[PDB]
């Protein structure tokens, strides 16, 4: 899951860069925020589909699960808040390597594995192994969420 | 002075510094060298992503082309050590401004515009205007290579 880890880390970095330029407005849906990012070329290493020519581009992970970058309650009478990067249907093995990798990378403000929100951004191999669920045949059953300031 | 030109100049100085700091080993692929540079924070502000082949982070210029920082190994006849910075899909306008700008203040040991290698590190706008090819629609057709210490 080396490519996958690098993809989420860079997507986060690109998103932070893009958000530093937004002022006076905020994204109200992941669909729009994700399409804008794709338009800027912030997701080159991932699978892009949907309809980018119409501003409706969608992002996918290596296993065909959807990836969505969405605002995290944008609005605080000041500066832009945070956002989340959610990746779906992640297989068990990948879920463990990706969640622990993002923890070690240290750039998030929180990592979630299914219904487990590690707001301290610390996820160990022992924690991941337990929280990441078994695949259903060849289909991953894990949803990972990476948060980013806040 | 502009963002684009500055990007190349900061990339070069950061790479010179990184190579100087390496002790006991050497890069053998642009994939690895560029990843390390990105991990070193040398490309903050530029678009980055992940390479499905190696899992390494990739770097991307202002027009959608890739930027690859690679070490200069042995080319069966080549011996100009150091490294090169290659950027593709460069629009004609940028090709002329960037190549000339790098000639003026890039501190290179050579500048190549497509199949023209200015080993004296001197490129004038008259030359660049001729060597840089026209765009295909909004797509740039130029490849620039900045050679460092050969």
């Amino acid at each position: 899951a080396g490519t996958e880890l690098t993809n989420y880390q860079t997507l986060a970095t690109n998103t932070i860069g893009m958000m530093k330029g937004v002022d006076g407005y905020a994204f109200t849906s992941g669909a729009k925020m994700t399409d804008t990012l794709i338009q800027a070329g912030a997701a080159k290493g991932m699978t892009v589909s949907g309809d980018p020519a119409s501003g409706s581009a969608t992002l996918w992970n290596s296993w065909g699960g959807q990836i969505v970058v969405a605002p995290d309650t944008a609005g605080g009478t000041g500066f832009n808040n945070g956002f989340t990067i959610t990746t779906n249907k992640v297989p068990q093995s990948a879920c463990v390597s990706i969640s622990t990798g993002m923890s070690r990378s240290g750039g998030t403000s929180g990592i979630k594995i299914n219904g487990n929100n590690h707001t301290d951004a610390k996820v160990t191999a022992e924690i991941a192994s337990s929280e990441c669920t078994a695949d259903n045949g060849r289909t991953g059953t894990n949803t990972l969420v990476f948060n980013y300031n806040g | 002075a502009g963002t684009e030109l500055t990007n190349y100049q900061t990339l070069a100085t950061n790479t010179i510094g990184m190579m100087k700091g390496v002790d006991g080993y050497a890069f053998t692929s642009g994939a690895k060298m560029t990843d390390t540079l990105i991990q070193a924070g040398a490309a903050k502000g530029m678009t980055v992503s992940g390479d499905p082949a190696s899992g390494s982070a990739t770097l991307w210029n202002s027009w959608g082309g890739q930027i690859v920082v690679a070490p200069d190994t042995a080319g069966g006849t080549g011996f100009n050590n150091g490294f090169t910075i290659t950027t593709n899909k460069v629009p004609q306008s940028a090709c002329v401004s960037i190549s000339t700008g790098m000639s003026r203040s890039g501190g290179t040991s050579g500048i190549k515009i497509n199949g023209n290698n200015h080993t004296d590190a001197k490129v004038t706008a008259e030359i660049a205007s001729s060597e840089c090819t026209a765009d295909n629609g909004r797509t740039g057709t130029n490849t620039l290579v900045f050679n460092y210490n050969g």
């Binding site: 399409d35 990012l37 794709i38 338009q39 800027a40 070329g41 912030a42 997701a43 080159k44 290493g45 991932m46 892009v48 980018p52 020519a53 581009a57 | 678009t47 992503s49 991307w60 959608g64 082309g65 890739q66 930027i67 690859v68 290659t86 593709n88 899909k89 797509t139």
Partner: peptide
């Protein structure tokens, strides 16, 4: 990446 980001690459 998406529109921004040619198909070529390097």
């Amino acid at each position: 990446s998406x529109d921004x980001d040619n198909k070529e690459x390097x």
